[PDB]
Amino acid sequence: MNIFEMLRIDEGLRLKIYKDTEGYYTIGIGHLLTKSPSLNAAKSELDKAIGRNTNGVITKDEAEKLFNQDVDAAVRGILRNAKLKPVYDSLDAVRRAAAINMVFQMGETGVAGFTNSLRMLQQKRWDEAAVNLAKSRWYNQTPNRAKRVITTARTGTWDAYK
């Protein structure tokens, strides 16, 4: 198991533009295209992201390409954020993957506001972190996924993805 596999299970793969859980235009492996309600905006952003006139559709490879850039950006995001990096460097490989997940999902900013879980995580207080993390909009809105992620952060193992 690894971040790419982990994320490919949580996010799925769609070759045509779609709306996500919040109702926003997405494509491929969870690549958010735009929070705007215009399908045309989405397609424009899409064509820009891709480099051709896709007409709202991409190949498996182009999606994979986006996913890679996205996983990268996410990690970089982490490393460039003052509240995040120390937490993350403190963590083992598994649990880092859990951090990347959340970030891929909710941006750096939002994860950066889990102040309290951040400290518990840093002190390696796994169970308390886990309870804290669950008290969130994230968890109530996407409970099955949040639990996989929380279990991974709480255990340091891939059992929830098995």
Q: Quick one: residue 104, left, alpha or beta (phi over 0 = left, psi -120 to 50 = alpha)? A: alpha
Q: Is 11 a catalytic residue?
A: yes
CB 111 → ligand XE: shortest distance, Å?
Answer: 5
Q: Is 20 a catalytic residue?
A: yes
Residue 82: is it exposed, middle or buried by C-beta count within 10 angstroms (0-12/13-18/19+)? exposed
Q: What is the secondary structure of 24-70 as a DSSP string?
A: -EEEETTEEEESSS-HHHHHHHHHHHHTS--TTB--HHHHHHHHHHH
CB 81 → Cl ion: shortest distance, Å?
Answer: 20
CB 134 → ligand XE: shortest distance, Å?
Answer: 9
Closer Cβ to ligand XE, 46 or 129, answer by number:
129
CB nearest ligand XE: which residue?
A: 153
99 contact choice in ligand XE, Cl ion, none (CB below 5 to 8 Å, kind-dependent): ligand XE
What separation, in Å, do the N-terminal and C-terminal C-alpha atoms of the chain show?
9
- Among 5, 10, 20, 47, which one carries the catalytic annotation? 20
The verdict on whether residue 32 carries a ligand-binding annotation is yes
Integer Cα distance of 136 and 143 in angstroms: 10
Which residues of this protein are in contact with Cl ion, per CB under 5 A? 49, 142-144
Closer Cβ to ligand XE, 34 or 132, answer by number:
132
Residue type, 65: K
Point out the annotated binding site for substrate.
32, 104, 117, 132
Active-site positions read 11, 20
Binding-site annotation: residue ranges: 32, 104, 117, 132
